[model samples]
Target chain A: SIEWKLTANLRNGPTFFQPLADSIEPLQFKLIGSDTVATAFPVFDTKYIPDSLINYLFKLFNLEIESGKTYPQLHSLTKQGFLNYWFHSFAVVVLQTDEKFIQDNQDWNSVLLGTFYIKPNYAPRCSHNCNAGFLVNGAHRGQKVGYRLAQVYLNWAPLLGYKYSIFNLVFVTNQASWKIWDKLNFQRIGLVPHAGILNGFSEPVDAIIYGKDLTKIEPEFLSME
Target chain B: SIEWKLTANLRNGPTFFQPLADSIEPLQFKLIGSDTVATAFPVFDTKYIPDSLINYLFKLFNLEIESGKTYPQLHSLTKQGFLNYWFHSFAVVVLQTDEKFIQDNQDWNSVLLGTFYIKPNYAPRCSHNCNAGFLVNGAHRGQKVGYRLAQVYLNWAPLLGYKYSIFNLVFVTNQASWKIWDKLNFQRIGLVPHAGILNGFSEPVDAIIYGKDLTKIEPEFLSME
Candidate 1:
């Protein structure tokens, strides 16, 4: 097995997405139809994040695992497991509203929108290519929270020194998830037949391997106003 | 993000390739046009293997790691790391001659040919598919040892309960390796561009993702008379 840099270099420090501003301004997004706005901040290291917010993300991820429809995880992960997997590298945490809203109202769970983590997909040799896992708050479905998180991932992943981004096991039955990648122009590099056994499905579902060259998108990201 | 069943179910027992007859007769292979006959066995559990043999395998694997060609590992693994990665589930160990020859010689290192391990490629959901890593003793090249190991792997993997076998990171530059998989009818399901940074290569090398249905091969394997 290859040794990964996740635990060695990231466990204690590098508390921010490198080459990016330390306190990234919360980017705003509009609900597909409604005037309601959503905000997201590119964050690294859960230690600096609010405990209430981390707990909310954990529950949201666990619920997805419980469903056994999208993710392949058959059981709920412990708090530590979740952090080690999701926050080992860098993450983007989203909110339904602005940071000031959370400041005024302490219920971080109620306003949390979605989140994702970015890390090297392979070891140092191929670590230039990164992998990411995304989770959207169940309560905030259909509001395009995942879309915002993905957009943020695109901006931050390349700046974080990744040349490419690959999603290795996006189950074919997971329409909502792969649909986002498709709509975002991620290339379908591979198909793994009968890759997972999902609950309620009589047959094993296949998986789509999605890839996008972050270097191609870096120009677009850098040219942003 | 998925919990695997490898360590949980296989850490202590099942010290064989399973359900098949224990003490499998060593399969015989002839060195290309040479009078020398090579042999191999489906083996499990390093606890039962000779220390000198294990040390030889460690050195062979470390040399492969040092080459930075076939495998993605950037550093030589410790003995525990090698065991945990290679022998976690199942393996096939090869020899230059029959078991009796090794007994008479007593120097297991000289007789060692090549070896490989097969285990769940992904997590529990997709673990029906297995992955393998191979190391050919440099002293015994051009003997078709890897081909023989692949043949043994094909026979034993399906019996071990895997429905498919996948090589997730077979570097395209390693012509000898992928050519064997291709000859054995493994499908080239995917290609990843610039997947590895290899030594002596200025540009990153691409990797081929190879797969074959173990279920498709089981009938043929079982019917061998």
Candidate 2:
């Protein structure tokens, strides 16, 4: 009797459009939400999640890029005003794969598409403990496509209730997101020294805080319907 | 360098809100940006903060008894408070309007009203090892106003950028909240066996993980412009 589940059949689609510009762009890889737009969702649908690509995925935590200096619209209005302040604790990840902009015009290009977010990094009963981010575009950045969207956010963090998942600071020279969260097991616990104020490193460039405990993992995934 | 400004002046003075009855809005609204909550600011201003108080201050946590077990409206409509309104935009609510610190008083439950959420129990460059939570009420529970709101969150956590503060849990018989966080020297570090079930004591208790290096707290506050 081995079993697992992270089910969220919550009106699974079109709660009203979100997924915008993924496959790099083909099946037109579209989705917009309000003021209306057409359709396309071989993947995510946090209602076509595109408040300007969620503030263009916080300019990859460039943290206002001040040191070397480039605001790029002030880090896109600080990730568009930090999703108006954490957008209900935040959650978004869309990647129906085949996304090389979906050639066959639509299909599983590799399986590791892009777009990611899973907020609430602290407070009261502790926002189930979490904080994540990603934005794969530059020719699908070094192949793992954010290790296939952190295995669909570590198998959808207890179906979004989250047992635990932290990653507060990785930049010890990003040995590539600390080697993809060290082959995705994630435990470093803490090390935030100079508060990581990175942009072009006048100094502060230390950070490690990784964590993972999404309620016991093991090739998990089981569903019975 | 006594500085203090977590201002969210979208407007300032009044619009109004205080709605809570078990269904969400438990104690949440935020700090990250949906224009930093102060009631989404604008009309009649006081920064428009009526996003919901359900009517604002719930009598300093006097330990409710509309028939006990702290219903806070069935814990704000239950999903156990979806990330306390998902990072309530980073949170910051401390209101009193002091007519000499609220005339009704035990320092109006130790200095009127308070809320602290500094942020980060995990990830994003560890913003100086963050994670904070302070809500003074429980009717000044064993008192000293959570040792006077942990002395204004360790002298207002390095004036708001934080240098280190984590109280992962403090139920080792609370010792009036982890023994005034170890007489404010903090740093118990680790321990969490049966984890924590709380006062009902159906068992499973034991917790201690209070930390504090808030860059070594000093400026106990004194600024006037």
Candidate 3:
């Protein structure tokens, strides 16, 4: 009946940010069960991102939306919708490679592994707690790219000034997603029955609410330990 | 940063609705621990409401936001903001009275007791479960107006097509609000620490997520038994 006013970010200004890992100093990790390494970069604004790269990420995200297993959107999003949803605040994009990661004019689709976004989960009073959504490129499944994305989230959300990170709706049927949260010690704080109407499902699926106290873990300790 | 695209309502048409109790047949209840009676009417659209009445409700809501203990808004919402937030999908407004309830041509401000709004908590796939916010008139506090407003919500949300009702942010320090949910048999499903920058609080406070299965209780049984 009405458009719920979108929540605003806590920080103002386009240049505001404190990157935990710089684009040049990209974090590197090995793909599970392989020798191939992957790199991640925290992206603050899509304006600076190449149109080709954005289009690729948009297609990958649309694939996830079509699956109806993770996100709640019933239809595929327009590029603008995708931008508003994923890049509303800050995001991390991971790329697969064994060599140094470059931020040049190279096509990223082939090397894209997984991605996640971070933003205020609620309005101002509760904005200190952020929310994030994740997606692993369909071609890169079983490589544990999603898990590494979660690890990077732990390192970056706190550095971005969020005291806690809350995932409002983690579909109960998605073992891959929730399993990663559990492995990272995120607590299952709540569950809502019949939360989503998924594809190939006769009945609606439930969703788990997960939360983590970011202040409890130091960013350096998150990766070092 | 970008504007998080606001979630849309599941129902598309303007004429969509299945009122459990019509506006003409307002529900009546006696104020808790008092002889004063109260009445509630389901309001589906604000366009039909009087400007004076909407303004009154706006001021009442602004009072709550200024308290900064319950809502997450850091500043008073513009009139349009209030409408978008509280009248987005469906709402119920209550009036204190001992006589027959009337819907037209009267100054509602003198009798306004409390009100609440219900809408999709998340986007399409998870939208079958709705979220709601409640507000009791400051002048009418201690009359248990909020409890009656909530009772009306339980009776109406399911009939409006929502399968479940969720309260995403009940400040942990808001004993009055959370206590009512507990007494109504709603489950406390999640909690987030440092969730708010509430007024007068030295440190940020925690928030509790509450949920109830609307399908578990029939509308008739909600008021009958």
Candidate 4:
């Protein structure tokens, strides 16, 4: 069985490791990783090492890890040493089978199955909110990779103090993606018409914004073990 | 004054000869230098060569040149020569020194003016009506060439028995051309929004259609004393 590694640092809040496993844990045996084993690591949210690693990951994803005049100062919030200054979240990385066992069978060119980025910005009035974007490599379609990623985020978001999560720029034409989110209880709040022009097509397509109330979910019951 | 030789041919009609002198004497003009020039050309209501020529000119100018099919058995009527033909009306050209001319000195290369072709077809009911497009060279703008051409067409149209004139696809943003048509009493019938795209501008422009009644103007008043 493949071993999954999960780590949580709640002192600064949650990290990607915590959110991914939390959201997808309920769906593990039914939809994903049913034939694998899962394990987790814990660290103090105030640890300088963990904070630096989180900041580095945020910068690697092209996310704003620093704050400036921009509305969402993602950069300033996640820059290595600066993670302690803001509420840090959990992060997870799942390994398929054992690394040594897959080394000979795996295709090096193959992309990751799925990945999620979830971060909550603290505003005294809106501390209960968070935002996220998800991506799954083309090779991994039809296996519910996106569903697993979103489930993980939703499950873990509230545990870290986020009451609500928002998904922006959900292309209306992405039927499968929207359906997954809709089935998971995300409410569509707005639709912008002619919001994006699809390549090779002259007409503009719409983008949908979705929101989910995470506080309503029963997190205590969402355990993969 | 330059001494100009005066010549007239029955096929040429009244328009070709009217500008040569203040008046015309068809029979005397037909007599070849009989010098009885005081008499105006006797208007004939026959559908022989003269009528055919006049109809041809009317169609060329995009006027309502009626055809026999528009009535009953048009093919048979037209085949019967002048006996079954109808004489609508006549007009003559008048020239003056005060008229403005566009591209008077520039080589025609700089101008993009074009003439439209009209033809009689199977549609008997609408064969009499036609349309044309014109453009003065952009370099020749503000010189009033359009006004001169319109005036000339107006004068030449009536002698061919065309009772109405039509101008289609005039750009709405072309205020100068619209003003000229307005001054000539052409009525605005309709406007097509975003009908055309012009260079140097991003937005679509509108097309305007103008029409005028030709028969209402007394032909005798057009004669030069």
Candidate 5:
């Protein structure tokens, strides 16, 4: 019922990642081919964009990092460091609409609201395994942008030489995200007790490792519709 | 019971990694602190001598299952290069006793047979949790070299910024590995349906992920003796 058009159509192919945008459909509903096949995520990344994403991650995963000067302070001064991890690691993307839409509607700026980064988790060996760290803007969330990003990732991983898509530490407290993982049939393999000081999920909060093999999967598992 | 002696005494400290040696007992009996005092696992890296362990790894683990690669294929190609993975990822070690007894006139050379490496199951950011992988020389196979390796690993993980040690897999077919991890209290969190080809048990075959938190453990939980 969130009534806005997804600015673009994406496919599970080489350009697997588009101007990365979070899909915003009702979380309770299962979308069919017509709705899923013709994805409406718009193209959208860069300077202004990266800064906005940093802000969102802090908001979404505040307890996820251990640093002083702050995230991108690390990611900024350490821009090369961030790149070293992702460039040597995985591709990242953003989703956005255009100037035409922005001009047509002054209510919102053309800010790319969603972002996600995927990395091989480890290198060369379990390199077949990759982990995705992601986020959706407050505006684009709940509609399934994160799920859309993940859907595209499964198809994109094998071509990228990865056979698994793993999330190293999904906050056990992160119900919405993981509920989707479970429904999608991702394996919940391990748990780290009190992994962080506080997400308030448990005594100190725990982190659970979730994974799914790309090469081997079930049709029902992959299809949400 | 199998008789073996650990050449070193390892502790859970900053160098979380030592010569990578086993934190052993007289091997004749069970042990405690003064019983085994802190603990030690000497650090063992590539190039000290390949001929000794290479034969055993490929022999016991077959192709790669041990470290995901057979000895030389990884060592030979990397020329001590692949060690970069361990160095960057986990501290690798071996377990052995001194020449004092082995060379007690009609004795053996001070030798190391079992080896292990521990690193973040994911990468460091998600790395409050780590995983240890290992191998034992055929000379000490059933004697529980891996058990001994894990014994010391518990004391070692904390020093490296990890709060937990985990194994994402152990074949259902791999009772030996499972037995030790189970005894160590690693939790069986989930299963990979047909993740692997064997289970080595009387039951069905599946890949089981086992894990445990190191820091929050009780003193009694850690002792295998």
Candidate 6:
């Protein structure tokens, strides 16, 4: 069994993109083969371009990419400028892997599906907890990567002396994440009824509040030694 | 100063009829004065009536009068019930005024307001808590009647070894009662939103769950203590 290693960093250093590349490189290789080799996962080398770039690539592949909008794009330009001036802290995490898996399966882009975030307040008061958003490629639904990511956060949270962990604005209808938190013994302390407006759906959905008290320990029964 | 005597009873026993008649005779004087002479008090002599008639009066006034169907009826019923019940295992306190004071003032009805209830379970499981209910005649409002009743209950509850006191189904909208509880440092632990429908009101009201720990004395400086 392969054990997963966890690391915390304030910023993406010189080898900032290494883990991101390692996790996704194997899958991309499995998909493309030796015909077009890309060093980076999401960023491909245009040098090794295929001859029929328009027909085979365009027809056989349809890209549905989603990424966080830039701070200025999401917020007003003035607000973004004010936020940047007041607080200048942000970071991301990359998970590195081995090369052997990449060569064996050229189209194995599923392993690169992990989570990352831009933590704005990376100081002591807020550093006790950090928030991260996840993306699991559709290809790797049952491989338990999301569960592993949550377990990673749980183990990491206590070590950092966070007495409580909170997840805000989780969709109430997201049954998969709800089941994961339930198994982890997180209590649903609040309910923001009908807070979310889903795309293509007229009725609003509730935002669930999930929290865990890390300081609480189960008391031993009288019979226990 | 005339210090009125107080008594409490848990159930009606053999002496229930005589004590009940003795108690009602004073109130009857006041009612007769109001009905006939426009005076503050009048005298009632039960000595001329036969023993059979006294028994019949006890059956009608003592029993039927105290079976509460309306507010006034309930007050009369509660008084007799408290007096009889206190003779057994319960307790009661009474306040009596001189005939001169009774004749000069009609507001002497303020002295009868109080509260009563059973102590909580004492089995190992539930020995830690108690419950109580209160009643005050409308004439007693703003005289700290409710507060005094609460103080009495608090003093008695702990003597019986109850560690916590609970008030069930206290309507959240009852701000006056809640303010008194707040003054006594009771915690509003839970809120059942929209749990009750008050009479003559179309909207539902919330039920508040309040608790106070008897073993610990909370300091005055803390709002939530």
Best by lDDT: 3
Q: Tens digit of lDDT per residue, candidate 2, span B103-130?
A: 2223334333455455545333343456
Query: Residue by residue across B87-139, what tens digits does model 6's lDDT show?
Result: 22223221223333332223334433333443442122232445554454445
- The top-ranked prediction according to DockQ is 3
Question: Chain B vs. true chain B: TM-score for each candidate?
Answer: 0.83, 0.28, 0.83, 0.44, 0.60, 0.51
TM-score of 6: 0.31
**CAPRI quality band, candidate 3:** medium
Tell me how each candidate scores on DockQ against the true complex: 0.72, 0.05, 0.73, 0.01, 0.13, 0.01
Candidate 6 residue lDDT tens string, A130-211: 3334344445456544544455445433433344455543566665455566766666644444333343446645545555
* Per-residue accuracy of model 1 over B61-95 as CA lDDT, tens digit each: 98998998888778899999988877887777777
In the range A1-225, model 3's lDDT, one tens digit per residue, is 011111132233112224332232357777767788787776667754567777888998898889878888878999899998888887778887655434655556568888888888878777777888888877876777777888888876776777778888898889854568888888888888878888878888888888888878645436722
What is the descending DockQ order?
3, 1, 5, 2, 6, 4
Which scores better on TM-score, 1 or 6?
1
Candidate 5 TM-score to native: 0.58
What value does the TM-score of chain B take for model 1? 0.83
The lDDT of model 1 is 0.71
Specify the CAPRI tier of model 2. Answer: incorrect
At residue A56, candidate 6 shows an lDDT of: 21
Interface RMSD of each: 0.9, 9.0, 1.0, 29.9, 6.1, 23.8
Model 5, B1-225: lDDT tens digits are 112222232222222223333433322212222142212333433333244443333344433433432221211333244455444444444435432222212211224445566765543234455766666556545655566666667765664556666676566656544667787787776554434322133332355667777666656645556
1 or 6: which has the higher DockQ? 1
Q: How much of the true A–B contact set does each candidate keep?
A: 0.80, 0.10, 0.92, 0.00, 0.14, 0.00
Where model 3 places Cα greater than 4 Å from the true spot, the runs are A1-25, A98-107, A218-221, B1-25, B97-109, B218-221
Give candidate 1 regions above 4 Å deviation: A1-26, A100-105, A218-225, B1-26, B100-109, B218-225
Query: In model 5, what is chain B's TM-score?
Result: 0.60
lDDT of 1 at A71: 79
List lDDT for all candidates, in order: 0.71, 0.43, 0.72, 0.39, 0.46, 0.36
